[PDB]
Amino acid sequence: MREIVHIQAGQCGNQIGAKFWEVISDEHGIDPTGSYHGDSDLQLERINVYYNEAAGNKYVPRAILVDLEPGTMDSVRSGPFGQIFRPDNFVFGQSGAGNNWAKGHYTEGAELVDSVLDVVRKESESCDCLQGFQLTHSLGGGTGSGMGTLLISKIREEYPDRIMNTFSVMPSPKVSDTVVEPYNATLSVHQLVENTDETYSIDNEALYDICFRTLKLTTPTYGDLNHLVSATMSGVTTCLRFPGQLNADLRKLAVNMVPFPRLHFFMPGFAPLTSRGSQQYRALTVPELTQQMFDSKNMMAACDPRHGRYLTVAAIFRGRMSMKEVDEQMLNVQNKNSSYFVEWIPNNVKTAVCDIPPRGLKMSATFIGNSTAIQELFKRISEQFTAMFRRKAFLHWYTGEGMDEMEFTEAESNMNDLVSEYQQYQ
Amino acid sequence: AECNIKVMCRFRPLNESEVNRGDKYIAKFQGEDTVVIASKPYAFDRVFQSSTSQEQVYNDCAKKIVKDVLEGYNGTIFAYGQTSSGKTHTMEGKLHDPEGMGIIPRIVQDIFNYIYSMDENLEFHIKVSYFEIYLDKIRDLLDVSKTNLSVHEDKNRVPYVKGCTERFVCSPDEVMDTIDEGKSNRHVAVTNMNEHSSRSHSIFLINVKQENTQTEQKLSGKLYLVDLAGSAKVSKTGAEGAVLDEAKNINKSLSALGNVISALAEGSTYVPYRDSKMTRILQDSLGGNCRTTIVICCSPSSYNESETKSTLLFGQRAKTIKNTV
Amino acid sequence: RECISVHVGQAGVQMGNACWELYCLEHGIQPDGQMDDSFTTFFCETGAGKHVPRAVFVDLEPTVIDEIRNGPYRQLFHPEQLITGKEDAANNYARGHYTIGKEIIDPVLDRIRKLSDQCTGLQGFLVFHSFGGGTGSGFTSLLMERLSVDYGKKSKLEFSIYPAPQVSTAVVEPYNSILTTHTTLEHSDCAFMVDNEAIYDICRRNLDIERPTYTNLNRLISQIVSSITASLRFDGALNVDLTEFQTNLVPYPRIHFPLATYAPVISAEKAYHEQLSVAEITNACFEPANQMVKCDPRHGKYMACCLLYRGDVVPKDVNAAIAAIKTKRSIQFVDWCPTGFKVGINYQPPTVVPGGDLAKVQRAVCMLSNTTAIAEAWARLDHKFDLMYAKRAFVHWYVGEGMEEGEFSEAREDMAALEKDYEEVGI
Ligand SMILES: Nc1nc2c(ncn2[C@@H]2O[C@H](COP(=O)(O)CP(=O)(O)OP(=O)(O)O)[C@@H](O)[C@H]2O)c(=O)[nH]1
Ligand SMILES: Nc1nc2c(ncn2[C@@H]2O[C@H](COP(=O)(O)OP(=O)(O)OP(=O)(O)O)[C@@H](O)[C@H]2O)c(=O)[nH]1
Ligand SMILES: Nc1ncnc2c1ncn2[C@@H]1O[C@H](COP(=O)(O)OP(=O)(O)OP(=O)(O)O)[C@@H](O)[C@H]1O
C-alpha cells in the first residue's frame, strides 16, 4: 500500500536520517527495541509504509544506511534508536573520500554500488507495492554528494517510473564548512536536475537564523537543527501514514508543485515554531499558523521570497481543525500579496489536512514552496564555482580519478541554465 | 546570417483502413504556397499532393540542403505528424526499391555522386551513426550490448552524443547495409492504426568532414536525419500494456519540442531546450548554424481532422522561427 | 423501484459515509445492520432480518476505504463492496484513466452487472464525485463511458463539487475539470453542481457556524440528495420519479447542467424563534446568496425550476407561493419556457441526525434549476485555463502519463462551443 524505502548518504544524511526515524517512532508508539507500546489503533494501520513487521510484534525500519567511512555507522548504531535498524543494512566502506566528488562517483563509489543495489532490491521485493524513494544527503563534501548522486542515476535506470524524492541540504556563502563546496554543489545539481522528480532545498544558514528569532535557543547543537528538518520529512508523508479529511500523497503534492520537468527544487518550512518560555503567550488556531508559514523568516532556506514570485505553494496540515478558517486564510495571503505571486496561475496554494497530529501539539503544518527567488542561492555558488574554475584551481585532485575537465564545464552549462529558467517565469 | 525555417506540407493517398471506412477527402490545395482545410488557409513554402512520388519530394525539399551542408554549414531534415501520416514512407521508404526509397538513401547517394564530380584534392572523411530512443534510454542499433548513452557539450557548447557507434565509411553501398542493419534490429509494434508503427525516433547522424590538400581548409557538416513518431490516440490506436508505455515516451518529445518551438514563436527569454533530451540533440537545428527544413505530414481523412489542424498550426508557428547561421 | 449508487474519489466516500448514515436512520436501520416497501429502493433484504445497501464505494487510494472498514459503520456495508486500489491519481485526469484505471475497472464493471441482474426495478444510476481532484475526474469519466455503451437508456445523475472563483484546494483543477467535462458533455443526462465556498457561506450567515468542517458540509448535502429521491421512498400526494429530473430540466441534449439550493437552514435556537411556512422558504430558495454556487442568477435567466417539498404541506400555499414568484420582477424567466415550474410533495418530513448541526424542521424544499448564470463560470474556468495553457504549465505530467497536446486543444474548443451555446440559447 504505497511503501516508501528510506535511503541515506553522507554524514549529514545519516544524522538527519537517523533523526527522521526517531521523531516518527514516537508518534507511532514504537519502542527503541522495536516493540509497540502506543495507544491508538491507527498507528498500526499504516506502519508497513515505512517499517517491516517481524516476530514478537516487532517492527524493523526499511532503512539502508550508506556511508563510505565506518565511523558514521558507529555513532548511529550507538544512538537511542540505533539498535532498531537492521544490522545487514549497515553497508559501508573503509577509506573515506575526504571531500572529493570524483572519488565517491567514479573510484570509491563503483566498488560499493554493487553492494547496495542488491540490498534495496531485496527491500523493494519485500513490500507489496512501492510508491517511491526518499533520500537524504548534502551537496557539500564527497560522500553524500558523490555516493548519493551516483545511485540516484542507478535507481532511475532500475525504477524510472516510481517517484524519486530527495532532501538535499545545499551550502551557503556566510556559513562555509568546506573549501571545495561549490564544485561539489555544481557537480551534484547536474544529476539532481535531470534524475529526480522532487527536491527540497534546505540551507544550514537559515537553520541557525530560525533558531535565534522564534526558538530563542542559547546553545543550539546539530541535534536541535535535526529536529526541525526531521519534522519536515514527517509532514510530507502524513496522509498515507494516518487518515485525513483530504489525502495528499507524495505524488499528489508533486503534480501540483512541479509545473515543469526541471523546476522541482522546493523550499521547506515548518510551524508552529515557538520557544518554551513563550508558549503560554500564543494561540494555536489556524490564522496565526498561516501568517507564520508565509513569513520570510520562517523557512529553512536563505532565499528572500520578497525578491521574487512564488510559482506554487503546498501547505500540508495536521490535526483536527475547521476547513472554513483554513480555506479562507489561504485566499487572503495570495490576494493581499498578489505582487509576490505569479499572475499566470489562478491559484498557487495546495491544501491538505490530517486528523492525527504530532504528540505535544494539537495543530501544525509543513510548508513546501517552489519560487523564483531560489535562483539567488544558485548563482552565488555558481560565482564561487566560476571564480575557482577560471584558473583551474582545485581540479588536479579530480583528474587523478580520471575525471575530465569538460565535465566541470558541462556542469557549468547546467548551472546557468536552471537559474535562467526561474528568471523566465519572474 | 539569419535564415527562416523551411516549412513544407505533404498529403498522401488514403490507406486501406481509411477508404473502407468511407472518410471524406478534406484536402484542398491552392497552388504550392498554401492549402485550404475547411475554409481555413495555412501558408507554407511548398505543399505536396497525394500524387507526388518519392523522387519529386526529394528534388523539391531536400535537394538544396546537400549543397549547403557540403559548402561548410550544417543541415537538419526531420519530419513531424500524427499516426498514419506517412513519415517513414516519406523519409525512409523502401530502401531496396529504386522508386519507393526515401530521403536517407537519396541523400547519401547524392553525397558520393557529388564527390565524384569535384576534384581529387578534396579528401572526404564521412562517418555515420544510428540510434533509437526506447523508454528514455538511447539504445544503440549497430551494437546490441549498450542500451544507454550520455550527451556531452563540445567547446562551443553545441551538444553531441558520446560512446555511440562510429563507422568510417568509404563506399556508398556500405551505408546501405548499415541502414538495412538498422531497420532489421529496429523494434516495431502492431496496432490497429499502423502495422509497421514507428514507436521511436530514428536519429541517423552523418558527421561529414572534408579537407583540402592545396589550401589546407578543413570543414565539417552535421547532417541530422531524424524521423519522429506519431502521436497515437489511445481511443483510435488502442494502446495497452507495453504499447502504451512506449506511446508515453514518444509523446514527451513532440510535446517537448512543442514547448520549445512555441517559446521561439513569441521569442521567449530562455527557450528551454533542456526540458527533454530529444530536444537537446535538436539544439543546433532550431537555434544553431543549421539550415533546418521541417516537413510536416497530414492525412486527408476526416477521422483525424483535429490532428491535422494541430499539425497545421504547428507548421505556421515554425515559419516565424529563424536560425542563427 | 430501485436505484444503484457509486462513490468516487476523496470527495465521494467522504459524503457517502455521511449520507448513508442519514439514509439508515430514516428507515429505522441500526448501524449494526438491521432494525416494508420504503427501504426496498436502497436497502435489500438478505434472508431474514438483515439488509445491505445498493451501492458501492470505489477509490484508488486506500486510506479512506479502510477507514470505513475500521470505522463505526462496518457491519452495515458489504466487505466486498469496499473496493480499494494501490496507486493514487495525484490530481491527474490521465493517471486514474489509462495507467491505473485499466487494471481496476474490470472488477468494477462486472460488479454493477450482477448488482443489476439481481435487481428488477432499476430506475437508473447516480454517481457522487468531484472533478476538482484526480480520482473523481479520470476514473469517473471512464466508468460512465463503459456503462453508457452497455446500458445507455438508463439515466445518470452526476454530483460534482466544482471549484470557486477565488477559493481552491488544488492548483491543477482547471486541467482536471476541462478534460473530464469533454467526456461528460455527451453521456451525462444531468449533473448537479455545488461550490465549495458557497456552502461555507450557507452555514456562516444562517447557521452561525464560524468554524465548521467537511463533516458538517456533507450533512446538508445529504438532505439534498435524500430529498430528491424522497418521493420514491415514501408515499406522496404528487409522486415524482427519478426520470422526472431528465425531461423537465434538460431543454437541449447538450445543456444538462442544473443548479441546486436548499432551505430552510436554521440553527437550534433560531428554529424556535423563526416561523416555518411555505412563504418564507420559497422567497429564501430563490435568494441568490442562498444558492450552492457563486453565480449571480440575476445575470442569467431560469430555463426551468423543479420544486419538491417535504413534510405536511398542503398543495394550496405552494401554488400561491410560486404565483408570487412569477410576479417578482427582480428575477427574469426566459421566453423559451415560461411555465418552468414543477412542484412536488412528500408526506414524510425532513429527518434529523442525533447531535447534528441541522435543527428539526416540519417542512423543507430542495430547488433545482437550470440557467445561463454558470455561462460566466465556464468562461471563468476557461479564462484561467488559457493563462496556464499559454505558458504550457503542468503539461509534462499529463503527457508523462500517455496523453499528448492534441486533446488539450479538443477540450478547449469544446468549451468554446459550450460557451456560445449558452449565449445564443439565452437570447
Ligand atoms: N542540520 C545538520 N547539519 C549537519 C550536521 N552534520 C553536518 N552538517 C552540515 O552538512 C555539511 C556536510 O554534510 P556531511 O557532514 O554529511 C559531510 P559527508 O559525510 O557527506 O562526507 P565525508 O564526511 O567527508 O565522508 C556539513 O558541513 C554541515 O554544514 C547535522 O548533524 N545536522
Ligand atoms: N464540499 C466538499 N468537498 C470535498 C470534500 N472532500 C473532498 N472535497 C473536494 O474534492 C476535491 C478533490 O477530490 P478527489 O479527486 O476525490 O481528491 P483525492 O481523492 O484525494 O485525489 P488524490 O489527491 O489523487 O488522492 C478537493 O479539492 C476538495 O475540494 C468534502 O467532504 N466536501
Ligand atoms: N505517400 C504515400 N503514398 C502511398 N502510400 C503511403 C504514402 N505514405 C505512407 N503510405 C503507406 O503507409 C504505410 C506505412 O505507414 P507509416 O509507417 O508511414 O506510418 P507512420 O506515419 O510512420 O505512423 P507513425 O506516425 O505512428 O509513426 C505503407 O504501407 C504505405 O503504403
Author numbering:
A (entry chain R): 1 to 426
B (entry chain h): 5 to 329
C (entry chain B): 2 to 36, 52 to 443
What text does the study give?
Microtubules are cytoskeletal filaments that play various important roles in cellular processes, including intracellular transport, cell division, and establishment of cell polarity. They are highly dynamic tubular polymers assembled from α/β-tubulin heterodimers, which are arranged in a head-to-tail manner to form protofilaments, with ~13 protofilaments associating laterally to form a hollow polar tube. In vertebrates, both α- and β-tubulins have multiple isotypes encoded by different genes, which are intrinsic factors in regulating microtubule functions. The GTP bound to β-tubulin at the E-site (exchangeable) is hydrolysed within the microtubule assembly proceeding via longitudinal contacts with α-tubulin, while the GTP bound to α-tubulin at the N-site (non-exchangeable) plays a structural role and is never hydrolysed.
The tubulin isotype α4A is highly expressed in various tissues, such as the heart, brain and platelets, and is mainly expressed at later stages of development. Similar analysis of the lateral interaction between α-β and β-α contacts in the seam region suggested that the α1C/β2A microtubules display a subtle longitudinally contracted divergence between α1C and α1A in the seam region; the α4A/β2A microtubules also display a slight longitudinal contraction (Cα atom RMSD of ~1 Å) between α4A and α1A in the seam region. Due to the longitudinally contracted divergence in the seam region, especially between α1A/β2A and α4A/β2A microtubules, we further compared the structures of α1A/β2A and α1C/β2A and those of α1A/β2A and α4A/β2A in the longitudinal orientation. Surprisingly, similar analysis of α1A/β2A and α4A/β2A microtubules revealed a clear contraction of α4A/β2A relative to the α1A/β2A protofilament. This contraction mainly exists between the longitudinal interdimer, consistent with that observed in the seam region. Our structural analysis revealed that, compared with α1A/β2A and α1C/β2A microtubules, α4A/β2A microtubules exhibit longitudinal contraction between tubulin interdimers, which could potentially be related to more amino acid variations between α4A and α1A relative to that between α1C and α1A.
